[PDB]
């Protein structure tokens, strides 16, 4: 009776009680920094617990700041919808354009065909394609995009009878092979998300917070530099994750294991079956002009990103130095070009070369607004903006200096220990909640702590920002885990056991690579730069 | 052959040719204001013609301005998503919450029950309810909300056989009664849109442009003052539109007319029939706590709008004088409170008075995020932002001074003829295209022309801003017209012949009321205020 009441209505209890319980923080102390602290506590608890939808919770600052003596209404709204957010939303639109007309399927099928027929080889190909696609597209999208192929091939293999998808006789228990495939897809999506700024929202969040906090910083997380910093480690731990997954389920190094016998059986007689099903499933047809135009536009957008400000040559931006151009212009330009261009080029028959029937109606464009309006996750605007506004208000109120003075005690420990504990704390926190919320909560605190001690802010911000995305244990940790658990009825215990490998691999790889190669990309990480001294002295 | 080629593919021809044709404007003159003028011409032609979707076209300034010397990328994105736009979007969300749980149906049915039984009385009540609903909600939404009731009552009457929906024998021709009802609903929605700032987008557009251009203006279009200025005229010409429709289709003043004889039959019988069917739709069950909570929240929001800064008493926004609240808090506050509050209060059986069964799951909130995400027209953000950015860029580049000096020749004519010609031009232009585009095009030009001559800007801005919404002649003019034409297969010729009336009525009413009662609400229209003199002298 009374026990299940907490089980059903705990969210309402949190919503009702937390604002009342946190009130003495405001009443006891007089400064406005304490009001900002009260707001921070309430919003952090709402994000972690998820009592309210994240998008709704992100709207609180609009109400809260003008009531208090923090910010005016117009400035708070200006903090939302920065140019960087426009770049991200345009990137989502271009990804939608790619998804439309089915370019992704052609790329995935071709790479799998290039990779070998053996079942171990098929797993390797699937992970690599997912990592490359998640590098530019949202993670949950990529998981949904990739699952049907493996589902179809597994069903065909079961039809031949070489392997069984489920245990023979409460949903049926999945076998080891399907667990391996699905978990590999989800993990590959999560790992590949970290490669690029537009790969996932968390990268955008901490990049934006760092840029807003320190305008005078001489080290920049622009698009090429971040990609240079991130790609090699991503490749290394993706490969190591693949090796660990093969060891855990396929019996890679144990020849006498019974699991290895199943792999050997799959090697002989199932290669032809999956090859036939893959060839038939690649029946899209000859490559149309639609896909060619979309691909050319995408490549042009990437090239525009890379050419904005290289050290080799001036490039654009330097030539157009009248005003400050940003990477927002290349994206929106691609979106507009996608809307203007046609899709068939069949109307040329009118002017000359009257071969074939003329079109009977208006030629469709590359994309339609109805598709965009129904698929874009518009709440990300409020979520990212709320993070930015909270950071800015915390800076202006002066509560950031209060935390900075509070945490000064950590100066005793050496830098490496700080790096390790920061990574561990970030992983532990992101295990239980959304990545973006954890990033918003922890990044400004790290910035202020790094200012209080004499440590370069990037040296702590980058590893933590990357580590916030590493979530593998529980279904609640990340949406791809929930989708994969739903598709194949994966029990939580098995996923929790399997998640041990990627966590250790990512932690070790991040530690070593940030210690070694970050100095190669950023020479001044070890020392304390001049502008950091100026900022700390002003603080 | 070649004749139909223009019919099929004219939009692509416009998109390809117009930028090439307007290019000599940029090449011949070296000023940056000429580049801004080229941009203005291109966007104006794209909006009027609708070669591209409006939302896509509004995205051009983000790409265009930083390339030229007009503005930086950061500021251009800041221009989008202002405070006022956030207020409007929150208002749309609250309207969606009202649509949820079906409060509007109860209100409309109750008012129709209050009004009498004769078809004239039913028509009058239906128009009044449509006007009141459109005062707070989008026009097309209200039309879709209201049509099914009249459809049902007409079908029931046809089943009884008192009147025929369509002419007896290509879609069937609707009879005069059906035309009257549907056209009345559409016209009522269009007319009631003008009552309030959040009623329609055009009001928001010109209010925002005026506020951005003149910060120092003493006269203000705040929420209560605008409503005071607008409501009485709205009532007068809504009533006059009702009388014209009754004379045109139901022979109100002519007893001998056959149409009057059909009305007499409708009064003699079947009034009890429509009353019975109306009661059947009224049986929605007793009013629930859900609706009561939503209604209380809505009333509280409106009261919060009025008490922001009244002349009678200080109110809020003066007690909290640390920052300018700027009327954004109430709307987002209501949106958040909609998610926070429950919907049943059936969980209290746990504590005491067990009574009925306890709930078996979490209690739903007043609204769900899925409903909001799928129904909000998100492209309005880009449309309004593009309008604001174009206005600001025109101000900064210096094109405004050029146009104002160009149009100085109109000083010869007296004030009244300027008012009349402005109203006529606004109506003629809005007849053929979207209202928001016309407002965006014409408002800044009016502001600059008003500065060039010694005329108070409001004197011309308000009548034109209201006149942009008056569109009845063609289905292209406004979405409600298209919906009504689709529902009842209305022919365009009949629609124009019917709409000839409300145009004249609205023009005369606006002229007289703006000349007479605007002085009562704003005392200083006739004179040229000091701040206007300062602005003109500086510019
Ligand atoms: C200078 C000083 C300034 C101080 C400023 C302070 C500002 C504070 C602002 C926030 C104040 C609290 C707001 C609470 C809103 C209502 C929350 C109700 C949640 C609820 O339904 O809880 C149920 C259990 O309630 C319980 O167990 C508790 C009993 C709840 C009874 C109803 C309470 C709300 C009644 C109206 C209060 C007044 C509102 C207007 C101010 C379970 O809900 P669930 O989990 O099943 O579903 C939840 C999703 N729907
Ligand atoms: C020095 C500074 C200068 C600054 C100012 C200039 C800046 C750049 C301006 C660029 C403007 C856009 C250029 C590309 C527009 C392409 C539009 C094509 C539209 C189209 O398909 O038109 C069809 C007929 O075209 C026709 O009959 C038109 C002629 C033939 C068009 C096809 C061949 C060209 C294809 C595009 C080449 C682009 C090259 C440059 C990137 C009918 O289409 P529809 O109406 O049935 O369907 C339309 C679905 N949206
Ligand atoms: C305005 C400002 O902050 N200027 C500083 C300058 O004082 C400092 O010497 C330099 C070191 O990199 O960084 C920059
Ligand atoms: C800074 C500024 O523009 N101040 C003006 C002031 O000079 C003028 O007397 C007053 C009357 O309109 O309006 C305000």
Curated annotation (Swiss-Prot), chains A, B:
Question: Is Membrane there in the keyword field?
Answer: yes
Name the UniProt key words of this record, in alphabetical order.
Cell membrane, Membrane, Transmembrane, Transmembrane helix, Transport
| Tissue specificity statement from the Swiss-Prot or TrEMBL entry | In adults, abundantly expressed in the fat body, basolateral region of midgut cells and oenocytes. Low level expression is seen in the halteres, procardia, restricted regions of the esophagus and hindgut, base of the legs and in a subset of cells in the third segment of the antennae.
Q: How does it sit in the membrane?
A: Multi-pass membrane protein
The record ties this protein, via InterPro entries, to:
Na/sul_symport_CS (IPR031312), SLC13A/DASS (IPR001898)
Q: Write one Gene Ontology MF term.
A: pyruvate transmembrane transporter activity
What residues form the membrane-spanning segments? 12-32, 51-71, 84-104, 122-142, 179-199, 225-245, 284-304, 328-348, 412-432, 464-484, 495-515
Q: What is its main location?
A: membrane
The protein's matches in Pfam families, at most eight in alphabetical order, are given as: Na_sulph_symp
Q: Which GO biological process entries does UniProt record here? A: citrate transport; determination of adult lifespan; pyruvate transport; regulation of triglyceride storage; succinate transport; transmembrane transport
Question: What does the record give as the function of this protein?
Answer: Cation-independent electroneutral transporter (not associated with membrane depolarization) of a variety of tricarboxylic and dicarboxylic acid-cycle intermediates. There is also small, but detectable, transport of monocarboxylics. Transport is through the epithelium of the gut and across the plasma membranes of organs involved in intermediary metabolism and storage. Affinity for substrates is citrate > succinate > pyruvate. Fumarate, a-ketoglutarate, and glutarate are also transported, but not lactate. Transport mechanism that is not coupled to Na(+), K(+), or Cl(-).
Q: Which family does it belong to?
A: Belongs to the SLC13A/DASS transporter (TC 2.A.47) family. NADC subfamily.
| Protein's recorded name | Protein I'm not dead yet
Originating organism: Drosophila melanogaster (Fruit fly)
